[PDB]
Design an enzyme around this catalytic site. Structure first.
Site, PDB file in Angstrom:
ATOM      1  N   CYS A   1      10.770   6.099   4.144  1.00 35.47           N
ATOM      2  CA  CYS A   1      12.156   6.117   4.622  1.00 35.47           C
ATOM      3  C   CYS A   1      12.421   5.227   5.851  1.00 35.47           C
ATOM      4  O   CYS A   1      13.544   5.193   6.363  1.00 35.47           O
ATOM      5  CB  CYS A   1      12.602   7.560   4.897  1.00 35.47           C
ATOM      6  N   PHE A   2      11.394   4.521   6.322  1.00 37.74           N
ATOM      7  CA  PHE A   2      11.547   3.580   7.434  1.00 37.74           C
ATOM      8  C   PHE A   2      11.186   2.137   7.040  1.00 37.74           C
ATOM      9  O   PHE A   2      11.674   1.178   7.648  1.00 37.74           O
ATOM     10  CB  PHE A   2      10.725   4.039   8.644  1.00 37.74           C
ATOM     11  N   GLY A   3      10.340   1.990   6.022  1.00 42.97           N
ATOM     12  CA  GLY A   3       9.822   0.683   5.604  1.00 42.97           C
ATOM     13  C   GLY A   3       8.565   0.803   4.760  1.00 42.97           C
ATOM     14  O   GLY A   3       8.408   1.768   4.010  1.00 42.97           O
ATOM     15  N   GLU A   4       7.662  -0.168   4.877  1.00 43.39           N
ATOM     16  CA  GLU A   4       6.467  -0.203   4.011  1.00 43.39           C
ATOM     17  C   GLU A   4       5.177  -0.660   4.687  1.00 43.39           C
ATOM     18  O   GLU A   4       5.202  -1.225   5.786  1.00 43.39           O
ATOM     19  CB  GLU A   4       6.734  -1.026   2.733  1.00 43.39           C
ATOM     20  CG  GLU A   4       7.762  -2.126   2.895  1.00 43.39           C
ATOM     21  CD  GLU A   4       8.098  -2.824   1.593  1.00 43.39           C
ATOM     22  OE1 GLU A   4       8.639  -2.166   0.677  1.00 43.39           O
ATOM     23  OE2 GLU A   4       7.836  -4.040   1.491  1.00 43.39           O
ATOM     24  N   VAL A   5       4.050  -0.391   4.027  1.00 43.50           N
ATOM     25  CA  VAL A   5       2.744  -0.827   4.507  1.00 43.50           C
ATOM     26  C   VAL A   5       2.038  -1.758   3.526  1.00 43.50           C
ATOM     27  O   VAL A   5       1.796  -1.398   2.384  1.00 43.50           O
ATOM     28  CB  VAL A   5       1.821   0.366   4.859  1.00 43.50           C
ATOM     29  CG1 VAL A   5       0.430  -0.126   5.274  1.00 43.50           C
ATOM     30  CG2 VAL A   5       2.425   1.206   5.982  1.00 43.50           C
TER      31      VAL A   5
ATOM     32  N   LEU B   1       0.810  -1.227   0.000  1.00 39.38           N
ATOM     33  CA  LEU B   1       0.000   0.000   0.000  1.00 39.38           C
ATOM     34  C   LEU B   1       0.848   1.284   0.000  1.00 39.38           C
ATOM     35  O   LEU B   1       0.410   2.317  -0.503  1.00 39.38           O
ATOM     36  CB  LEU B   1      -0.969   0.023   1.196  1.00 39.38           C
ATOM     37  CG  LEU B   1      -2.047  -1.059   1.307  1.00 39.38           C
ATOM     38  CD1 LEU B   1      -2.661  -1.051   2.700  1.00 39.38           C
ATOM     39  CD2 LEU B   1      -3.117  -0.940   0.225  1.00 39.38           C
ATOM     40  N   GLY B   2       2.044   1.221   0.581  1.00 39.60           N
ATOM     41  CA  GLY B   2       2.923   2.386   0.664  1.00 39.60           C
ATOM     42  C   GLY B   2       4.363   2.017   0.961  1.00 39.60           C
ATOM     43  O   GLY B   2       4.646   0.915   1.415  1.00 39.60           O
ATOM     44  N   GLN B   3       5.270   2.950   0.688  1.00 37.68           N
ATOM     45  CA  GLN B   3       6.694   2.799   0.973  1.00 37.68           C
ATOM     46  C   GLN B   3       7.200   4.133   1.527  1.00 37.68           C
ATOM     47  O   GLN B   3       6.579   5.172   1.302  1.00 37.68           O
ATOM     48  CB  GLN B   3       7.466   2.408  -0.296  1.00 37.68           C
TER      49      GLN B   3
ATOM     50  N   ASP C   1       1.747  15.426  14.861  1.00 32.38           N
ATOM     51  CA  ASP C   1       1.716  15.394  13.403  1.00 32.38           C
ATOM     52  C   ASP C   1       0.308  15.101  12.879  1.00 32.38           C
ATOM     53  O   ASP C   1       0.103  14.281  11.991  1.00 32.38           O
ATOM     54  CB  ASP C   1       2.750  14.412  12.862  1.00 32.38           C
ATOM     55  CG  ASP C   1       3.000  14.573  11.358  1.00 32.38           C
ATOM     56  OD1 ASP C   1       2.741  15.651  10.749  1.00 32.38           O
ATOM     57  OD2 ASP C   1       3.462  13.575  10.780  1.00 32.38           O
TER      58      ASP C   1
HETATM   59  N1  LIG Z   1      -3.912   0.676   8.780  1.00 32.81           N
HETATM   60  C1  LIG Z   1      -3.942   0.981   7.486  1.00 32.81           C
HETATM   61  N2  LIG Z   1      -4.972   0.524   6.739  1.00 32.81           N
HETATM   62  C2  LIG Z   1      -5.061   0.801   5.442  1.00 32.81           C
HETATM   63  N3  LIG Z   1      -4.131   1.541   4.830  1.00 32.81           N
HETATM   64  C3  LIG Z   1      -3.078   2.031   5.519  1.00 32.81           C
HETATM   65  C4  LIG Z   1      -2.946   1.764   6.875  1.00 32.81           C
HETATM   66  C5  LIG Z   1      -1.762   2.424   7.232  1.00 32.81           C
HETATM   67  C6  LIG Z   1      -1.165   2.452   8.482  1.00 32.81           C
HETATM   68  C7  LIG Z   1      -1.159   3.605   9.264  1.00 32.81           C
HETATM   69  N4  LIG Z   1      -0.581   3.627  10.460  1.00 32.81           N
HETATM   70  C8  LIG Z   1       0.032   2.540  10.953  1.00 32.81           C
HETATM   71  N5  LIG Z   1       0.680   2.309  12.100  1.00 32.81           N
HETATM   72  C9  LIG Z   1       1.103   1.046  12.094  1.00 32.81           C
HETATM   73  C10 LIG Z   1       0.732   0.466  10.949  1.00 32.81           C
HETATM   74  C11 LIG Z   1       0.071   1.365  10.218  1.00 32.81           C
HETATM   75  C12 LIG Z   1      -0.531   1.314   8.963  1.00 32.81           C
HETATM   76  N6  LIG Z   1      -1.276   3.004   6.144  1.00 32.81           N
HETATM   77  N7  LIG Z   1      -2.019   2.775   5.181  1.00 32.81           N
HETATM   78  C13 LIG Z   1      -1.802   3.295   3.824  1.00 32.81           C
HETATM   79  C14 LIG Z   1      -0.314   3.587   3.535  1.00 32.81           C
HETATM   80  C15 LIG Z   1      -0.364   4.869   2.679  1.00 32.81           C
HETATM   81  C16 LIG Z   1      -1.406   5.707   3.428  1.00 32.81           C
HETATM   82  C17 LIG Z   1      -2.511   4.672   3.745  1.00 32.81           C
END
Ligand SMILES: Nc1ncnc2c1c(-c1cnc3[nH]ccc3c1)nn2C1CCCC1
Length: 257
Positions: free
Chosen positions: A20-24, A16-18, A127
Site C-alpha cells: 500500500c506504499f510501493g514495492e520492493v 520481490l513484493g508490492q 512491529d
Molecule cells: N532487503 C531485502 N532483501 C531481500 N528481500 C527483501 C528485502 C526487503 C526489504 C525490507 N526492508 C526494507 N527497508 C527498506 C528497503 C527494504 C527492503 N523486502 N524484501 C522482500 C519483500 C517481501 C518480503 C521480503
C-alpha cells in the site's frame, strides 16, 4: 547526505513484493552490487523517508543495512539484499520442513542480538514479527522494516499505546512461537477481539508440540503482564546462545523439532 546516489546507477531487475506504499525490487547498484530497492508509489514523502532517516543512525550486523537513497520523487531506498526474503516465507516454504530446534534457536538469538542493539540505542521497533525479519545465506537473520497487528502486540501497547522495548520483548515471545510452529499464525482459531479479551484474562498460548517446556517458559517470561518484569534482549540473547549447554544439554531432534 553522503548517502545520495545517481538514479542511473540503479537497475531494478526482479520485483520481490508490492504493498500500500510501493514495492520492493532485486537490483544492481554500480553494476556490481546486488541490492534490495524500495520505491514510494507516488504515503507522504516525508513519511516514507523516515525509515532511511532512522537506518542512517543504526548500524549493526543483525539489522538490514541501508546502502543509499534517492530523496526526490520518485523515491528509492537501497539496502543490502537478503536472498531468502522474509522469515515468514522462509519458515513456510520448502526449508521449513528441514529446520530443527538448533537452527530456530540460533535464528532467535540472532534476532535477539539485533533487538539488543535497538534496546541499547534506545529505540522501539513496534512491529517486531517474523514477517519483518529478513533471512540470507547460512541462516543469517536480520531485523528489518523500520517504517498494529494485535496478535503480536503487548496488551499495554495495544490498549493504551504504551509502546516500549518491553512491548517489543512481548512480540519476541510471539515470534518464538512462529519459529517453533514454523510460521503458523499465533492464537490459532481466534479472532482479534477474542485474542485481546483472552490475553487480558491471562490466557497465553500453550507449549507448541515437540517444543521443550524450558523454551515455552521463556516465551512466558516475555508475556508477563507487567512490562518491567519482562527480560531484556541482552538476557534473551545470552539465554538463546547458551541454550544447548545451559538449558537443554540432552536435547534430541524429533520429527519436527
Ligand atoms: N532487503 C531485502 N532483501 C531481500 N528481500 C527483501 C528485502 C526487503 C526489504 C525490507 N526492508 C526494507 N527497508 C527498506 C528497503 C527494504 C527492503 N523486502 N524484501 C522482500 C519483500 C517481501 C518480503 C521480503
Amino acid at each position: 547526505d553522503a548517502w545520495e546516489i545517481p538514479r542511473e546507477s540503479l537497475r531494478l531487475e526482479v520485483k520481490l513484493g508490492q504493498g500500500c506504499f510501493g514495492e520492493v525490487w532485486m537490483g544492481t547498484w554500480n553494476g556490481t552490487t546486488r541490492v534490495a530497492i524500495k520505491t514510494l508509489k507516488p504515503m507522504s514523502p516525508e513519511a516514507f523517508l523516515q525509515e532511511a532517516q532512522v537506518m542512517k543512525k543504526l548500524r549493526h550486523e543483525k539489522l538490514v543495512q541501508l546502502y543509499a537513497v534517492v530523496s526526490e520523487e520518485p523515491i528509492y531506498i537501497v539496502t543490502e539484499y537478503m536472498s531468502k526474503g522474509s522469515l515468514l516465507d522462509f519458515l513456510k516454504g520448502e526449508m521449513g520442513k528441514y529446520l530443527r530446534l538448533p537452527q530456530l534457536v540460533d535464528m532467535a538469538a540472532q534476532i535477539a542480538s539485533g533487538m539488543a542493539y535497538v534496546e541499547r540505542m534506545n529505540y522501539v521497533h513496534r512491529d517486531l514479527r517474523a514477517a519483518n525479519i529478513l533471512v540470507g545465506e547460512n541462516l543469517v537473520c536480520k531485523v528489518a522494516d523500520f517504517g498494529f497487528p494485535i496478535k503480536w502486540t503487548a496488551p499495554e501497547a495495544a490498549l493504551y499505546g504504551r509502546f516500549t522495548i518491553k512491548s517489543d520483548v512481548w512480540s519476541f515471545g510471539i515470534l518464538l512461537t512462529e519459529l517453533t510452529t514454523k510460521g503458523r499464525v499465533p492464537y490459532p482459531g481466534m479472532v482479534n477481539r477474542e485474542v485481546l479479551d483472552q490475553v487480558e484474562r491471562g490466557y497465553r498460548m500453550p507449549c507448541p508440540p515437540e517444543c521443550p517446556e524450558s523454551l515455552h517458559d521463556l516465551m512466558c517470561q516475555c508475556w508477563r503482564k507487567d512490562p518491567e518484569e519482562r527480560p531484556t534482549f541482552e538476557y534473551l540473547q545470552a539465554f538463546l546462545e547458551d541454550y544447548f549447554t545451559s538449558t537443554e544439554p540432552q536435547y534430541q531432534p524429533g520429527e519436527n523439532l
